[PDB]
């Protein structure tokens, strides 16, 4: 049996066939509670009170010790390396040889020689992969994500991770800390005082990310929980959590760029058979027989703005042949309130030979990566909706997706919503029908934004 993805993949058939019909199930964000209150008071708190956000669970940890850390990191990031010291973060952005993101994470300077890692497995994976193959002097300390479902098992993570988000965050953030704390600029990481231990922080109306050894967690979440009670914290569950990138902007979920091509053979076959290239799923109305289709470049899904070309790093060169003014552009879509009614009712319709797709809330994604086509009014494929749900705070239906470089701001497009032929194997797809759900073009983090109206609809010239 296979070992490895690119065994995997030889035995397997089609690249696209298999992920669209994995048998992995979910992609869960694990251990903390669904719900301490309410998903929907929870979201609205993050908007117009406080929360603090569990982050402990559902991101890989990759500790990094050595000479020779900064020197890995330098040689696969698109980002900029100059001038980076420590208690400064980055948004690490890795492409492959031919340009297309493999994943990205938070990657903390903690100290000379000392950095982590904090995202999901595909980066882990291929930092690890580098680290181990390319003679790099460093130390790697791999934290996984905890089990999906640890049904009653202790779970056991190296540190705890919170965030304390919202209106009211920094008045929670200094009564936690006995006194005014400086609020640093974006990114920038120092510390704080909670429960009379020293807690490192990252700057996040601010908020801040913090974290600790494990044994203190709950020493801290009690700590922040009755601090912030005077102004309204609550605690924000895991169904509601992954939401809020919708109403943010930051897709989670390219497909790790990894699986054609002979400049990463030698990946494939070093990557497990269980590991979340091999083993994971996409989902969504998007079908294509080219794995390639599925691709996405930094340009794509707005890191554009990371790209420097002041260093040598994997894939520059094909980095450097792209034209950045044609891309895709990650966009807002909005979707239509009386199509997603129109979805729901379907439910309770016990007449009709089949339903729409369940869009369950308040986040619909039915796979590790979500691949939904966007089309015009012409059925011209016009972009890829790659995350998908619910805002409480907008009433209304939200993706991120990459779309066509010239459609204006405003446009209304359809997102293709549901898999074709009753739906893939996929074991979150119950059987359904596709709809074209009716969306607007906004901006991102999301803005509420005009339908432009044009004379049969928006196509492409
Ligand atoms: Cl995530
Ligand atoms: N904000
Ligand atoms: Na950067």
């Not at 509670?33 to 309410?38: G, I, Q, T």
């Not at 559902?58 to 900064?70: N, P, Q, T």
């Not at 339903?355 to 039915?366: Q, T």
């Not at 797809?429 to 049969?456: D, F, I, L």
Request: aromatic share 12%; proline share 6%.
């Amino acid at each position: 049996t296979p070992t490895n993805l690119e065994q995997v993949l030889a035995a397997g058939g089609n690249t696209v066939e298999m992920l669209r019909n994995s048998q992995i199930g979910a992609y869960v964000y694990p251990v903390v509670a669904p719900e301490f209150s309410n998903w929907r008071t929870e979201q609205w708190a993050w908007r117009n009170s406080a929360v603090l956000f569990d982050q402990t669970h559902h991101m890989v940890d990759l500790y990094i010790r050595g000479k020779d850390a900064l020197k890995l990191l330098s040689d696969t990031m698109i980002n900029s390396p100059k001038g980076w010291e420590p208690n400064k973060a980055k948004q690490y952005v890795p492409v492959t040889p031919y340009g297309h993101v493999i994943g990205d994470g938070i990657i903390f300077y903690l100290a000379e020689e000392e950095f982590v890692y904090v995202g999901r497995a595909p980066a882990a994976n291929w930092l690890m992969y580098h680290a181990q193959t390319g003679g790099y002097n460093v130390d790697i300390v791999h934290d996984d994500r905890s089990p999906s479902r640890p049904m009653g098992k202790p779970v056991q993570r190296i540190s705890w991770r919170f965030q304390i988000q919202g209106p009211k965050a920094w008045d929670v953030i200094e009564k936690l800390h006995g006194g005014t704390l400086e609020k640093l600029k974006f990114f920038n990481m120092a510390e704080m005082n909670i429960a009379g231990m020293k807690i490192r922080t990252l700057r996040h109306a601010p908020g801040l990310e913090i974290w600790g050894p494990y044994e203190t967690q709950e020493k801290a979440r009690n700590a922040i929980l009755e601090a912030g009670k005077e102004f309204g914290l609550i605690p924000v569950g895991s169904r509601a959590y992954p939401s809020n990138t919708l109403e943010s902007g930051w897709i989670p979920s390219p497909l790790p760029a990894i699986y054609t091509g002979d400049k990463l053979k030698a990946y494939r076959e070093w990557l497990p058979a269980n590991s979340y290239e091999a083993s994971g799923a996409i989902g969504g109305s998007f079908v294509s027989s080219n794995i390639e289709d599925y691709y996405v470049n930094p340009y794509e899904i707005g890191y554009g703005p990371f790209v420097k070309f002041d260093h040598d790093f994997i894939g520059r060169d094909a980095l450097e042949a792209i034209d950045p003014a044609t891309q895709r552009k990650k966009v807002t879509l909005a979707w239509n309130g009386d199509d997603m009614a129109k979805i729901y009712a379907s439910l309770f319709d016990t007449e009709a030979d089949a339903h729409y797709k369940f869009f369950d809330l308040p986040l619909a994604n039915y796979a590790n990566t979500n691949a939904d086509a966007v089309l015009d009014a012409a059925g011209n494929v016009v972009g890829m909706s790659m995350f998908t749900g619910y805002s409480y705070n907008e009433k209304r239906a939200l993706s991120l997706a990459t779309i066509d470089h010239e459609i204006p701001v405003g446009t209304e497009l359809t997102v293709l919503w549901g898999e074709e032929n009753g739906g893939t194997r996929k074991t979150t797809v119950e059987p359904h029908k596709q709809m074209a759900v009716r969306a607007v073009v906004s901006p991102v983090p999301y803005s509420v934004t005009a339908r432009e109206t044009y004379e049969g609809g928006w196509r492409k010239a």
